Amino acid sequence: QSTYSRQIKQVEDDIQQLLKKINELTGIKESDTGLAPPALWDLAADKQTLQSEQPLQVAR
């Protein structure tokens, strides 16, 4: 009862710090998904990134 009670106080501080860590635990890596063929894709993508003419907006 008594012996446990101190474990209770300490555990709460532990959980707080852990909530931030789940983000990291899932992955530090910035990536979502990617396979070796979107590397080829990427060279093309670069120009589209470079230029402000693209992306294309939707209008009506």
């Binding site: 008594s2 009670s5 106080k9």
Partner: peptide, 15 residues
């Protein structure tokens, strides 16, 4: 002090 007062600190000092 031990039970009636419910917080964790009173029990541990009291033990």
């Amino acid at each position: 002090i031990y039970e009636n007062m419910a917080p964790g600190e009173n029990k541990c000092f009291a033990a």
